[PDB]
Design a protein around this ligand. Sequence first.
Ligand code: HEM
Ligand code: HEM
Ligand SMILES: CCN(CC)CCc1cc(F)c(F)c(CCc2cc(C)cc(N)n2)c1
Ligand SMILES: CCN(CC)CCc1cc(F)c(F)c(CCc2cc(C)cc(N)n2)c1
Ligand SMILES: C[C@H](O)[C@H](O)[C@H]1CNc2nc(N)[nH]c(=O)c2N1
Ligand SMILES: C[C@H](O)[C@H](O)[C@H]1CNc2nc(N)[nH]c(=O)c2N1
Ligand SMILES: [Zn+2]
Lengths: 415, 415
Amino acid sequence: RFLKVKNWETDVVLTDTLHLKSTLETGCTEHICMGSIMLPSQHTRVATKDQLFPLAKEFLDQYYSSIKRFGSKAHMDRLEEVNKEIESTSTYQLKDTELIYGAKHAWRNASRCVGRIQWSKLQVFDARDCTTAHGMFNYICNHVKYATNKGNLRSAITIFPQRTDGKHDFRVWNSQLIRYAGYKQPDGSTLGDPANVQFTEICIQQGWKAPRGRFDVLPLLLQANGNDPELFQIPPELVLEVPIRHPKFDWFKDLGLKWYGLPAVSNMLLEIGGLEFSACPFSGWYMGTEIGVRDYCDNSRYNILEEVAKKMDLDMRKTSSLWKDQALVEINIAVLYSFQSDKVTIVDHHSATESFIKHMENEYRCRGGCPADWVWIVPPMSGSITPVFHQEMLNYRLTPSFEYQPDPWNTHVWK
Amino acid sequence: RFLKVKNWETDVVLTDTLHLKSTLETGCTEHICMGSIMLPSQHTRVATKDQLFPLAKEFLDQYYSSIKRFGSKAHMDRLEEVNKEIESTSTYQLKDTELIYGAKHAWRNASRCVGRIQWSKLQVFDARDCTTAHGMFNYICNHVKYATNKGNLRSAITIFPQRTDGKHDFRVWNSQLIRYAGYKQPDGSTLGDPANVQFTEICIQQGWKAPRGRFDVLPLLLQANGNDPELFQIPPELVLEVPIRHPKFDWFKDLGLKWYGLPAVSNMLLEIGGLEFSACPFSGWYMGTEIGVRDYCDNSRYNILEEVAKKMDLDMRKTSSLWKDQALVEINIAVLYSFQSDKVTIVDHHSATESFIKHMENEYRCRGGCPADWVWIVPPMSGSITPVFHQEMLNYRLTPSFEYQPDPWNTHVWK
Ligand code: HEM
Ligand code: HEM
Ligand SMILES: CCN(CC)CCc1cc(F)c(F)c(CCc2cc(C)cc(N)n2)c1
Ligand SMILES: CCN(CC)CCc1cc(F)c(F)c(CCc2cc(C)cc(N)n2)c1
Ligand SMILES: C[C@H](O)[C@H](O)[C@H]1CNc2nc(N)[nH]c(=O)c2N1
Ligand SMILES: C[C@H](O)[C@H](O)[C@H]1CNc2nc(N)[nH]c(=O)c2N1
Ligand SMILES: [Zn+2]
């Protein structure tokens, strides 16, 4: 069917036909909806040569039918040229223009990303000539320097060689290029980021010397062509950081918090015409709530609601005092204000969710729809005073796409 | 399959097998997830006699297999007794114990209700001997008096005669028993509740004399046995109200807000063993955010973020000042504090979402699962500092159930 989605704050109706092009599967059925399962066994991704040419043809048909040359001579010859090469090698190689298109549309198709209004402004760095972890480190550094741009952040992706057999894989073992370390204490508590305690100790295992503090930047663990991964330290001058202060409470500086400017995810898989790129770090800029709500106030992360409430003079005895809510707002005003006063790109959840509604309108117009995961798009605070709360959204999977993949340390043949 | 749901704040895993009993359909498919569509064409509900006995048998099998007498003599005789009566009349009549069971389990099965830990403490008022709108008014008044209990609120449902042919329907035209009126102005703005502007003018149409103010309690519009609906005014002494003040800001009293104590939905349909009860008003007590976030701060409702921010001395020029967020927290501390100081039952979104996680555990233990709609369960503010944000939830439809139904004024043969 050609389904309708409604906004209940403005009564706007849009018609989705793009879902007819949808290919992958959701995890839902007619009798169960799994839209709140985090890592369904569909959002995660070994493929053979028979299955490859339909996926190449499907992709190539979209590419040429977008540069305004569907079915022309250049299209049919590339169709045959790729057919021939999949016959010869049981794989094939994207042109540079095809790689840039595919990467931009994987982002365009990321239903859980609220930032996609920017999808066509993506800088693609082709690292498919990389062969060693040192080369990887070099490519990653250049990506971090470019994307940061002195705090005037620029979105970018670096794409390492595609998977071939499976035992020869390029992988970044870090989940993000820039992350703070987590250390478990002699008693039991946690210094730094509890999320990374396991990875912090893998770096310790392979040889890292930990400054065992709070906001210690982890080294990169880089695996090239299936070889064992090697440690490298991002030059500190390349890691831009923002000390968090408040435009009111002067005790807020004493909290001694700070965060890094560059959100750069490095553990996911990029799929383009049936080709799988197992190392493809991509970066943008932060929405404020990622740091102030999730990073700082998740119970299993930094978990600072306690201390901010104390210093705010809050009624912490009762739950219905909303002391947690009240400290959460101040923390997020602070993250935003610090980044802005330092000229580091950041977006608040009101501006970002408005832009995504604007983006949704454009997509239903010039595309017939916009796949969207409400569970992930609505921000983790103040949900219903943002316009995405009230927007019905259809979730479906289109390719090119970003997918989850198993962690390398559970699947790698070592020693 | 026998699926697993995970909590990512505590790493707890539960196994859902109850979804195998699921019967209805979600709206989702393998290729699209519609978990954010508000009123899917499945959550809404004319049935014949052939389809009726499977639904009666299915229901009767659950009922007897719960009072610890599955398949016994009393079960098989009621099975045959209902079979005989569906042969004779092409419908049938629930026993009183069956009605109480069915109603309690419709609530138990309401995947969008965060309050269900209380599902077994429901007071069921049998109004199936009702025949006139005056009788309806009398039954409703008694329900409002009982459920309110001097501010010590008690959950309750009143069940009017079941649908028979379709043209003879009991209906409450109000969407809730107690609602404030909405009036459009001579210029264009809105006094009172903008949500009810249409219904407020239907009461005006049928003869209501509007005190054209803010918090005017609407009359009841009651339709009995398919006849045209008639207006009745709930005695003011039965409508308990809470003036909203703040435990800090003394200008907050000057805002002149108040709300009613009793949330009582009256426009939905109760399905029990294939029988449809088109009038079945049910009431509980409020979660604070329903009033303070949605009722007061929705753009298309009372929309008070402006005035509270002004009186709070807020930087309203910029969006990233989070002045909206900051005023939203104060408004909700105020709703909670007013209700509590007046001894009117209310629950904060932290206590309620903790109880639902507790409830989910009980259901997976003694039931094999708990159908749950994440999109509706996560509260509309401070989502991720409540434990339901981090809880994966399977949504599926079980019967007995509450369903949506068309508004009566679009389907009724008038004059
Ligand atoms: C340019 C500014 C950007 C902003 C403000 C932004 C914002 C966000 C946010 C808030 C999330 C939710 C993440 C979470 O809560 O953990 C997200 C998810 C995501 N973003 Fe964007 N993002 C941006 C750029 C990008 C870029 C450049 C890419 C890829 C080239 C990308 C791809 C994704 C993907 C694949 C996900 C979710 C993965 C999944 O769970 O399936 N984003 N983004
Ligand atoms: C006892 C205290 C109760 C609390 C605290 C509570 C809380 C809630 C809340 C917050 C919602 C979301 C509504 C919205 O956001 O508009 C909800 C929905 C709902 N509640 Fe409960 N509720 C309670 C009692 C009941 C009772 C007694 C019934 C029926 C007998 C019931 C049935 C439902 C249904 C059917 C829905 C959602 C309908 C739908 O959208 O499909 N609730 N409840
Ligand atoms: C493991 C699953 N979760 C943790 C439970 C994290 C997954 C995840 C997957 C993404 F693609 C993703 F972008 C993020 C947020 C980081 C980010 C990146 C960019 C480019 C911009 C931005 N603004 N933010 C988190
Ligand atoms: C028309 C769809 N929406 C508006 C878009 C409203 C539907 C709806 C359907 C319910 F069953 C429902 F309970 C509510 C909240 C009112 C309520 C009732 C009770 C018993 C307890 C409580 N705490 N709250 C709203
Ligand atoms: C259980 C639930 O799916 C999980 O907590 C999700 C909910 N929505 C989210 N949304 C975003 N943007 N990021 C997240 O990490 C999550 N977590
Ligand atoms: C579009 C979206 O489905 C709609 O705004 C829903 C979202 N979740 C909700 N959740 C609750 N509890 N109440 C609501 O009215 C809504 N509205
Ligand atoms: Zn679904």
